[PDB]
From a paper:
Like other TNF members, Eiger is a type II transmembrane protein with a single membrane-spanning helix, an intracellular portion, and an ectodomain harbouring the name-giving TNFα domain. Eiger activates the Jun N-terminal Kinase (JNK) signalling pathway by binding to its cognate TNF receptor. We crystallized the ectodomain of endogenous Eiger of S. frugiperda, an important agricultural pest which impacts food security, and solved its structure.
In this study we report the structure of the TNF domain of Spodoptera frugiperda Eiger (SfEiger) at 1.7 Å. We concluded that our structure constitutes the soluble SfEiger TNF domain (part of the Eiger ectodomain) which has been released from Sf9 cells into the culture medium. Several highly conserved residues, specifically His7, Leu71, Tyr73, Phe122, Phe154, and Val158 form the inner core of the oligomerization region. SfEiger possesses an additional α-helix located between strands A′ and B which is absent in EDA (indicated by a black arrow). Finally, the surface of the SfEiger trimer is decorated with a remarkable number of histidines (30 in total). Analysis of packing over multiple unit cells reveals sheets of SfEiger trimers which are aligned in a parallel fashion.
Numbering used by the authors:
A (entry chain A), B (entry chain A), C (entry chain A): 1 to 13, 27 to 170
Write the structure that this text describes.
Amino acid sequence: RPFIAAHFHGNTSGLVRVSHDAPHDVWYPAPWTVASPHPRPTLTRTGHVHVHHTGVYLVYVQIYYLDSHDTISWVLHRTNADIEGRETLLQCAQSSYSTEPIDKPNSCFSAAALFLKAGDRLAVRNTAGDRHSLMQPEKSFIGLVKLADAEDPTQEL
Amino acid sequence: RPFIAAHFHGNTSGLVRVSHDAPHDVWYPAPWTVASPHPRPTLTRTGHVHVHHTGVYLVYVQIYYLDSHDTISWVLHRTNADIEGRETLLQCAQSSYSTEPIDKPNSCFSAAALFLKAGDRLAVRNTAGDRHSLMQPEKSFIGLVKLADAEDPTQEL
Amino acid sequence: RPFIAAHFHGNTSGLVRVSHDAPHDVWYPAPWTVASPHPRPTLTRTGHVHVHHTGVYLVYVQIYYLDSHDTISWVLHRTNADIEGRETLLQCAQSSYSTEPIDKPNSCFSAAALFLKAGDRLAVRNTAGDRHSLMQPEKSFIGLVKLADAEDPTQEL
């Protein structure tokens, strides 16, 4: 049974400013992913995760913010040659009120079983412009594990 | 190998007020769950997840709050014809102090490998009365994936 | 197929003060883990999870803090006879500013697909001294599920 899976983590080879509408792109495959003998999702030079096999995947994302804004939030965007624009599959948010801009650490994690198609690209974007995150391997990452085969469950109208 | 798994996400077809002790009930199966050819957990009209196969499951829950209370928290309640009342399997909490009631977004995620019996019902309740959450598919959801067969690991005394 | 997996949860048989640099050690296997007929990770008397089989694991941790500090954070430490000191595999953080020390609940969850070797020990430590957490089964836990075989993906230089 092939292990169609990959883990990519932050690697600045760690504070990174992410501009409005830019995807997080300081990802790098973990060693077990680099060494994996299995067909698997891959990482593009733009920071997108490139899915090569259709199925239901467990997808998980963590962004570790070190930021002074009251609200930090990310979205997982899915693109594909067969759809116009982006689809938002997952969202995480953390928020607290402060009167002054104090930098503070907050990791925002989410995960779900998601249907993904061969040819999909996945990117993580912040929902609002200019947030700072720590791109260190234990702090920020995106990974996915194929759980089952599946036909496309949606059709056009 | 059957994929005994399901994902249900928020769908108001998105802000919902959840009354004290009421379960979150604006769930709907994701398309891959609707289309799944496999035996799987199902969703009742009360919002409970109905487990049909005994085993160890990965269970995950996210509630996306948009609320002005200082503390937001949910509990995962397990019921079954063979037990009196509810069992709390999982709990999530987020809290910060503010002097005035400012609405702010906070997603509360948790997951674990849990033993579930055929006939179990699972519901998510807030721990305190009247919190508002965003019931949109990318923001709030509950899913489970059977990982292994298992006999009942507890017995009565 | 063996289910090489275990779940350990907080059990004070629930507020616990964890001293600086001490590992969380009020863990206990969940009933399905106690009853599992499979080879699996085990729990040491020091609170470390003892890995017995090399592979890629889904590892997840939740610490439920009930604490008055502005920042709460934990790290997952990996040790092994073949490495000097500790490796940090995973980190979670939550932070908000308050002018006075008000106790408040915050669960800090993270998970990832991690390469683990037979003989590894895993411990959860707080990053800063003296935080209080609730060691109740639904609130705080550490679990892992082996997903695939894997050779050691790193070599010395």
